[PDB]
Amino acid sequence: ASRLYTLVLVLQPQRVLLGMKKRGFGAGRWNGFGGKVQEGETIEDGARRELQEESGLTVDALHKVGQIVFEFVGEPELMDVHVFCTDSIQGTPVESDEMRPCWFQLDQIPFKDMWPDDSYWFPLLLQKKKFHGYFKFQGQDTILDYTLREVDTV
Ligand SMILES: CCNC(=O)c1cc2c(-c3cccc(Cl)c3)ccnc2[nH]1
């Protein structure tokens, strides 16, 4: 039993756009743009919607780069996160109710203020490798189990 989510990373040649999450789950960490896929939209549609809702930005194209499954101990629903990349943004990022956007240099990624699983998979994305990951968390700080591999098809 799993719930569909999207995550979009805006990755340009020498920088990445992250947003400080201002409220809800994982508030106080720098995240990519995403959320729950709704009834009546495709996964990709949901990714675009979340990006626009959270940052103002629209894009030409999204590229599938990964899938991560998250289990949180004591929560019934697994999270099935479809991860996308883009380097064809249209607009300037702006702050929303949910996210405060900021550009980071690729050697200045704020890992200490990110989800701890990010240290494992985010480098694969920077290296342009497609991946499947699974992370079992106890609360929001502790990884109990994980798997991570590269794949040919996301
Ligand atoms: C490189 C930036 N990484 C992330 O943006 C990132 C997000 C998450 C989430 C998460 C929680 C709620 C909704 C969604 Cl879509 C994801 C859970 C664990 N690790 C994460 N990492």
Side-chain angles (χ1 to χ4, degrees), residues 4 13 27 29 33 38-39 52 121 132 138 147 150:
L4 282 174
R29 281 165 168 175
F33 301 90
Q38 287 162 15
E39 292 151 356
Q52 202 277 341
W121 64 266
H132 279 185
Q138 189 152 64
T147 68
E150 285 111 278

Side-chain angles (χ1 to χ4, degrees), residues 122-137:
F122 193 64
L124 298 173
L125 189 132
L126 296 176
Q127 295 162 32
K128 313 197 200 217
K129 287 171 183 216
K130 302 172 158 63
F131 63 81
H132 279 185
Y134 164 70
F135 293 89
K136 176 187 176 168
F137 272 83

Side-chain angles (χ1 to χ4, degrees), residues 5-7 9 18 25 30-32 34-35 70 72 79 81 114-115 117-118 121-122 137:
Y5 288 81
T6 62
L7 193 57
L9 279 307
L18 301 173
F25 192 62
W30 294 99
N31 299 355
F70 296 107
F72 284 91
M79 298 177 53
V81 187
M114 280 161 84
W115 284 89
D117 59 291
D118 293 0
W121 64 266
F122 193 64
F137 272 83

